Amino acid sequence: MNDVNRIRTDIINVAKTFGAEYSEKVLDEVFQVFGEQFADNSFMIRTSNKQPDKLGCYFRYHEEDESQLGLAWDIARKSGLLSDQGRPVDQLIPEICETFPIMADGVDFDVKHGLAKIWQSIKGVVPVQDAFKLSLPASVTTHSDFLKNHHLDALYAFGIDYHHSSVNLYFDTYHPKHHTSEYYKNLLQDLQFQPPSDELLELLTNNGEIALTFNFASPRIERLCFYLPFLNREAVPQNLLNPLLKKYINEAPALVDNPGFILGWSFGPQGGKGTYTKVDVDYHGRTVPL
Numbered sequence: 001m002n003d004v005n006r007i008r009t010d011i012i013n014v015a016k017t018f019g020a021e022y023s024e025k026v027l028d029e030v031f032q033v034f035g036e037q038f039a040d041n042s043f044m045i046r047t048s049n050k051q052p053d054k055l056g057c058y059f060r061y062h063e064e065d066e067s068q069l070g071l072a073w074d075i076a077r078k079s080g081l082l083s084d085q086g087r088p089v090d091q092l093i094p095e096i097c098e099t100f101p102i103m104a105d106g107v108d109f110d111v112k113h114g115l116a117k118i119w120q121s122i123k124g125v126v127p128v129q130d131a132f133k134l135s136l137p138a139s140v141t142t143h144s145d146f147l148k149n150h151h152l153d154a155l156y157a158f159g160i161d162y163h164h165s166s167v168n169l170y171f172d173t174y175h176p177k178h179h180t181s182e183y184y185k186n187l188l189q190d191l192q193f194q195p196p197s198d199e200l201l202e203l204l205t206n207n208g209e210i211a212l213t214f215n216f217a218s219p220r221i222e223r224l225c226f227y228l229p230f231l232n233r234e235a236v237p238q239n240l241l242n243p244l245l246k247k248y249i250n251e252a253p254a255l256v257d258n259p260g261f262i263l264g265w266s267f268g269p270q271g272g273k274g275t276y277t278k279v280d281v282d283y284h285g286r287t288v289p290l
């Protein structure tokens with residue numbers, strides 16, 4: 001369709017507009033193999049802040065259709081976009097699929113580097129201890145007391161990062177403290193991560209999504225992320241966005257006049273690497289309303 005070539009053009013436009021490194025060759029190979037799954041599924045375009053003056057650009061899709069579940073991994077492997085290094089990360093997706101009933105999956109793409117991440121969403125929420133049999137990083141188990149103590153133990157999804165050999169764990173915000181700003185202040189303090197502004201803390205009371213990143217090199221929790229949805233460009237708190245990301249919320253491409261957004265705040269060791277902002281445009285306009 002034209003829908004697919006529209007999507008490839010919008011992304012090169014973003015990558016160029018916002019100074020994001022990219023590889024036309026790489027984009028081609030991804031779209032050759034995955035283009036239709038973009039036009040036919042929940043689809044989002046991301047820019048992040050990991051480097052002060054230039055955004056990176058990503059694009060991702062979410063497969064909710066029962067019959068298609070598992071084809072993302074198959075497609076990824078058969079075409080060579082995801083090849084096996086025997087890495088500690090490389091066995092996780094098969095293990096997850098045998099252990100847990102799966103209700104959604106998705107692929108994340110880096111406009112320069114190609115296929116970056118694969119998500120698995122469990123059917124329903126599970127005690128995180130049920131994931132302890134998997135070849136996750138040792139740092140997951142060794143923080144089991146910390147996961148329970150901060151009510152980060154209702155596990156619903158895995159994100160497997162192949163560029164960084166790291167794993168994201170996703171947590172439902174079941175506990176009354178998750179609607180409290182003091183919980184996010186105390187969580188960032190306990191992790192010795194960079195403190196949040198009061199504006200962000202206020203927003204986090206109606207937070208609903210928490211993610212934790214673990215990797216095989218480090219005995220420490222590498223970073224965490226909070227996610228909030230916003231219905232449209234206007235609903236976005238723009239005092240939390242630097243100028244480059246302000247421009248992105250006004251000019252991010254989508255097939256609706258006023259797309260919704262998912263914003264992500266990554267936090268890591270204070271004075272260290274991983275405290276930045278993520279902006280996801282709801283390209284089709286049907287991810288955010290759900």
Ligand SMILES: CC(C)=CCC/C(C)=C/CSP(=O)(O)OP(=O)(O)O
Nearest residue numbers: 044060061062159168225227262264
């Ligand atoms: C990705 C799609 C289509 C919908 C979900 C929006 C969402 C929660 C994205 C999170 S991907 P994330 O784990 O935040 O990626 P990292 O930067 O942590 O590697």
